[PDB]
């Protein structure tokens, strides 16, 4: 029985939302993460053809392991996941692209798991108003949803810092938000811990105070979809778990679009997360089968 080599990068959001009152989220993430590792590396170091790498992220990404068959090392890093402020989903994906760049596996998969909106992203170089876009007219688009939400709850969505007298302009239906189809050349990747801020803070929308009416906002959910697209263009399959998103359309739809397609997007709760990782492992393992060697 022949299988092609496969390399998997796990990218796990460890934002503050995973802990505190919500600690069931972290605990199930840790249980299911280890379950997935064991399922994919059943022989440990002797598992032919399979390797797993691990990224966690909060306001910055963390390389927890390069590609490895070392079940114990991976499981120890998963058990050490820690809720920390910030959701730099673009950064997690960017570090996954860095790691996958060295792969010569035939099959190349990224698993992204996040329980919230992205609120951090990398700076845009030589930024102009053309790097932003307005309402699409598709009410399910992350663009239209974030604009509508920020109209309903301006200080929840838009970067603002009450400890200073500085103040953003808040959006209307005419406002423009970060695109999700910028070229890779547009992002400053010189520092994977960097984030765009206004008045010292980030957010679901980050005000670009240099630009005029109708007002312009970086949109980290769109930046994350943009980064996912670079990975898919490189040939990597993305499976995304929208984790405990509680029927919040912006969070659901923003994460759905990072996946290879809608069939690679899973809506999970802590209670049923293991079933999503089981299905992803099954899909990966079905995909690598190349039959038997029976030349004669
Ligand atoms: Ca979160
Ligand atoms: Ca302020």
Residue numbers in the entry: 138 to 433
Wording from the paper:
P. gingivalis expresses two antigenically distinct but structurally homologous type-V fimbriae that are important both for attachment to other bacteria and for invasion of different host tissues. Thus the vWF domain is a clear indication that the D1 domain of Mfa5 functions as an adhesin, but the ligand has yet not been determined.
However, no phase information could be obtained so a shorter construct, Mfa5138–435, encompassing only the predicted vWF domain was crystallized. The structure was refined to final Rwork and Rfree of 13 and 18%. In the Mfa5 MIDAS site, the five residues coordinating the metal ion are situated on the wrench head on top of the β-sheet. Mfa5 has a classical MIDAS motif36 in which the side chain oxygens of Ser152, Ser154, and Thr224 coordinate the metal directly and the side chains of Asp150 and Asp252 coordinate the metal via a water molecule. One of the loops in the ARM2 domain coordinates the second metal in the structure.
